[PDB]
Amino acid sequence: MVKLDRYIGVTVFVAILAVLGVILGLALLFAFIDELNDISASYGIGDALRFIFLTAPRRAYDMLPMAALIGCLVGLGTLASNSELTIMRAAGVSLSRIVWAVMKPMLVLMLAGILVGEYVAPWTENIAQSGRALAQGGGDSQSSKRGLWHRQGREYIHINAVQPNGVLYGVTRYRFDEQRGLESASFAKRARFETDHWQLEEVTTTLLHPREKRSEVVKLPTERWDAQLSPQLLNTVVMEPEALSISGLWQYIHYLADQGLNNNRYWLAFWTKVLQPLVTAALVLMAISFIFGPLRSVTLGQRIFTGVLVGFVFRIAQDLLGPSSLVFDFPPLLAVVIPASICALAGVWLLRRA
C-alpha cells in the first residue's frame, strides 16, 4: 500500500507543519509583548528582537508535542469528513494499518525533534541568553537580574553576566565573618578568567576600620578571586535546566550526585527530553482515536477547538505533576509517565469501542 500511505502521510505532515508555524508564531509574539515591559536604556527594541528570535528553536521543540496533536487532528479530519476513510476501511484496510500510516511521518518528526533539541536548541538558547545577559546589566554592581549568586559561609557573591568564550562581567561580593570587620567590600568589572582565578578589575572594595575610620576604595586590574565555581559549571548553573542538552544534563546530574547535592530537579528535565517521542506518540494515538469516534463528522473549527482544549489540559497537568515531585516525595519519572499513559489508555479504549 504505497499510494495511500503517501496520501495519508503528506496530508498529516503538511498540517503539523502549518500548525507549528502558527503556534511558534503566536508564542514568539506574546513573548515580545512581555519583553517590551523591560526594554529600557541598555535593552533596545531591536536587541529584544534578537532574544525573541534566537530563542525560537527552543520554543518549537516544546510545542512539538502540541503541534503534532493539533496537526494530526486537522489533517486526519480533512480526510474523515470527506468520507475518504470509510472508503479505505471498506476496501479491506484495517485500522492498525491506518494508524501505522499516520505514524510513519511522525516517527521522522520526532527524530527531527530529538536532533534539534539535542544539537541546535542549546546553542541558540545559550547565545540568546548570553547576549541578553550582557546587554541588560553590564554596567552596575547589583543592577542586573541575570546575575549569578553563590554561597559560602564566610562570603556571598554576585556576578552580573557570563559569556561562553570566557569573558566575565560585573561582580559584587560581601564577606562577613561573625566578627566581620568591614575591611573590604566588593564591586568589580571585567574578569576574563585568568588561569585559576577570576581577575576582578577596577574593584571598588570599600576599605574601612569599623569602630572609628574612613572608607577608601582600592582598584586593582589584577585583583583575583579564586574559583569555587569554574567556567563550565558557570555555563550550566546560569542556564535553565530545560535548556541543557541531554548529554549535558546527564553529566550535570552525575556531578551533583558526586557532590551530594540534590539533583531531583534535573531528573525531570532529562526524562522530559528523553520520553518526548513516547508522549508525542501517545498524543497522536489519542488524536487518531478522536477522529474515528466523536469527531468523525464535526467541522474543522470544532476539531481545532477540541485539540486546543485537550492540549491545554495536558500541559497544565504536566505542570501540576512536575514540581509536585519535590513538594511530595514521589519519583520524578511518574511526572512525565502518568499523563502520556492516561492519554494512550483513553485512546486505546475509544478505539476499542469503535
Partner: protein, 353 residues
Amino acid sequence: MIVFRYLSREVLVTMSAVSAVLLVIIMSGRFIKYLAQAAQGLLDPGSLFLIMAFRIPGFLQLILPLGLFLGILLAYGRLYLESEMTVLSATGMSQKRLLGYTMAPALLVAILVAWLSLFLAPQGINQFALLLNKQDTLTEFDTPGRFQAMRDGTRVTYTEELSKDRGELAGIFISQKDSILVAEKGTQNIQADGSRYLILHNGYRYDGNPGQANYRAIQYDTYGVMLPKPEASSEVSERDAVPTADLFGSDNPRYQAELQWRLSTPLLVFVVTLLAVPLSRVNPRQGRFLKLLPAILLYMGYLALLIAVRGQLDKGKIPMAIGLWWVHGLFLAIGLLLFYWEPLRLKLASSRA
C-alpha cells in the same frame, strides 16, 4: 417578549458554563505558578488554599466578559445553524433589535463585574496580603541555609543554617539595602503582627553599602528584619487594595489611573456584545466554533492595550483626561464597523443602481 426571554436565557446559561470552565483553567494556571515557589520553600505548601480562595474576585472579573463573549457567540451560532434565526429575520426582527435583546443580559453581567471591581476585589486583595504579613514564613523558614536573594533585591533573605530556630545565628543575613540592616547575629525576637522583626543582640545596621562603594558607620540594632515579603511585592501594591473612595479625588497619578482601570471593566462588557452579535453569524459549514479562538486573541489584545496605557498614565506620559478612554474607542469602532458593514454595502448598491 417571548423571544426576549429566549435569547436572554440561552445566552445566560452558555455564559455561565463558559465562565466556569475559564475560571477552572485560570485557577489551575495560577496554582502551577504558586506551587513551584513552594517547592523551592519560598511559600507555605499548607497555605495554598486560602490564597486561591481570596484571589477569586480578580479572576472572575477578568473572565466574566470573556464568558459573555463566548456565550453569545456559541448560543447565537447554535440558533443560526438550526435555522431558528433565519425565520426570525424572515418575520420582521431587525438586526438592531437583536442587539436590544442581547444588551439585557449584558447589563446584568456588567453590574456583576462593576461590583466585583469596585467593592469585592479590593477587599480580597487586602486580606490576601494581610495573610501574607500575618504569615509569609513568619516562623521557621529562614534558609542548611540556602542562599536566597529577594526579587526586589533591597533585602536579602538568609540564615547561617536554615535555622528553624532562627535564633542567635552566627550570621543572620536579613540585610536590606537601598541604608542596610546588617546583622552581626540575629536573636529570634519575632512574630510581631505587622511583620516579623528580630532583635539582634548585636546588629550593625551598617547603612553604607558597597554597591555605591560607600561605607557608613552604625552599631548595635534590635527588631531588625524588615518586610522582605516576596508575594505581596509580586502582585499587590496598596493601589490594588485601596478603597475606591480613596481613589476618587486623589492627585497621586496612580490613584487617578486606578479609578479609570477599575471602571474600565464594566464598559468592556458592553463593547464586547457589539462585537459578538455581528460575528455570531455562521454558515452551516463554518460552525459555532471556528471563531471562538480568534475572539479570545482579540479580547486579550483589549486587556493588554489598556494595561499598557495605564502604565503610561501613571508614568506621566499621557494626560489623565484622555485616559484609557481612547482604547475603548478603537474597540467600539472596530465593533461598529463589523455591525454596519452589511447595511453599508447594500446602501452603496442602491447608489450604483
